[PDB]
Amino acid sequence: MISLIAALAVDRVIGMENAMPWNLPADLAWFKRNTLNKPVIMGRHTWESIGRPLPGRKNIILSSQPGTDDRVTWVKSVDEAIAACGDVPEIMVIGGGRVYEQFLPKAQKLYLTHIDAEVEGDTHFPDYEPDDWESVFSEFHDADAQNSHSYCFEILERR
Ligand SMILES: NC(=O)c1ccc[n+]([C@@H]2O[C@H](COP(=O)([O-])OP(=O)(O)OC[C@H]3O[C@@H](n4cnc5c(N)ncnc54)[C@H](OP(=O)(O)O)[C@@H]3O)[C@@H](O)[C@H]2O)c1
Ligand SMILES: Nc1nc(=O)c2nc(CNc3ccc(C(=O)N[C@@H](CCC(=O)O)C(=O)O)cc3)cnc2[nH]1
Ligand SMILES: [Mn+2]
Ligand SMILES: [Mn+2]
Ligand SMILES: [Mn+2]
Numbered sequence: 238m239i240s241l242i243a244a245l246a247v248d249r250v251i252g253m254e255n256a257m258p259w260n261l262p263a264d265l266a267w268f269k270r271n272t273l274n275k276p277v278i279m280g281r282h283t284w285e286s287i288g289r290p291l292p293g294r295k296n297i298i299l300s301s302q303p304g305t306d307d308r309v310t311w312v313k314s315v316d317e318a319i320a321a322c323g324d325v326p327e328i329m330v331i332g333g334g335r336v337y338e339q340f341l342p343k344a345q346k347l348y349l350t351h352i353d354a355e356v357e358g359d360t361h362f363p364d365y366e367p368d369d370w371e372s373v374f375s376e377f378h379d380a381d382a383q384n385s386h387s388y389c390f391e392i393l394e395r396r
Contacts, residue, residue: 238326238327238328238345238346239319239327239328239330239340239343239344239345239346240327240328240329240330240344240345240346240347240348241329241330241332241337241340241341241344241346241347241348242268242271242272242329242330242331242347242348242349243331243332243337243347243348243349243350243362244257244261244264244268244349244350244352244388245349245350245351245352245362246259246352246354246355246356246358247352247353247354247355247356248358248361249361249362249363249364250356250357250358250360250361251332251333251334251358251360251361251362252286252333252334252358252359252360253356253357253358253359253360254359255282255285255286256286257286258356259352259354259356259385259386260385261350261352261384261385261386261388262383262384263378263383263384263388264350264352264384264388264390267348267350267390268331271329271348272291272294272329272331273293273294274293274294275294275295275325275327275328275329276294276295276296276297276321276322276323276325276328276329277291277294277295277296277297277329277330277331278297278299278318278319278322278328278329278330278331278336278340279296279297279298279299279330279331279332279333279336280298280299280300280332280333280335280336281298281299281300282333282335283331283332283333283336284296284298284309286333290308290309294329295310295321295322296308296309296310297309297310297311297312297318297321297322298310298311298312299312299313299314299315299318299336300312300313301313315339315340315343327346330344333360334360334361334362334363337362337363338363341363341365344395345394345395346392346393346394346395347365347370347391347392347393347394348390348391348392349362349390349391349392349393350388350389350390350391351388351389351391352386352387352388353380353386353387353388354386368396369395369396370393370394370395370396371393371394371395371396372391372392372393373392373393373394374390374391374392375389375390375391375392376389376390376391377389378390
């Protein structure tokens, strides 16, 4: 099974200038809980944005060019990325925009954080079709001293 995990600001913005400008520790904790001990697939730009391997996960990087770091696994196509995960219950696709576009048609589950924040951005999560997806979990949180915007964790499953 393939799942996508992402945090979206207003208008489905996910990034600006190869960065995420906000800081929401509760959402990063949610990301870690839902990805630990699973393979994670990311594109090369997202690899550069994170800047280091994510511990406790098999890190698989998509790039058309040879890899430059043997601490992670480098693959050249979607099918190779999936194969490199092996026989696991759940593969996590962690972006960015171009990668989300390619994996969305193959995904059964979306883990989305909706952040109440207006961000200028240059990268968006794909337009998906709402009728295709059922909300199976949602949890709203007001802003607090650690998290400066309100946010909503949602899990969608393909109908
Ligand atoms: N808010 C969130 O949840 C979230 C999550 C992830 C990322 N982001 C943000 O998203 C942005 C990065 O997204 P992006 O769309 O620019 O880039 P991306 O999807 O991370 O990376 C695209 C790169 O991946 C490689 N690639 C993708 N598909 C491939 C394929 N089928 N075969 C081979 N290589 C493939 C290519 O690398 P080569 O050019 O080397 O061939 C391509 O240039 C940043 O702003 C980041 O902060 C946000
Ligand atoms: N919900 C969500 N939030 C995100 O921030 C996110 N980020 C990416 C890609 N970028 C990043 C950037 C940093 C870290 C990171 O530092 N993660 C640590 C945090 C642990 C914690 O804060 O508790 C990790 O071990 O996962 C992960 C992904 C993909 N999907 C996401 N999905
Ligand atoms: Mn092929
Ligand atoms: Mn197999
Ligand atoms: Mn806000």
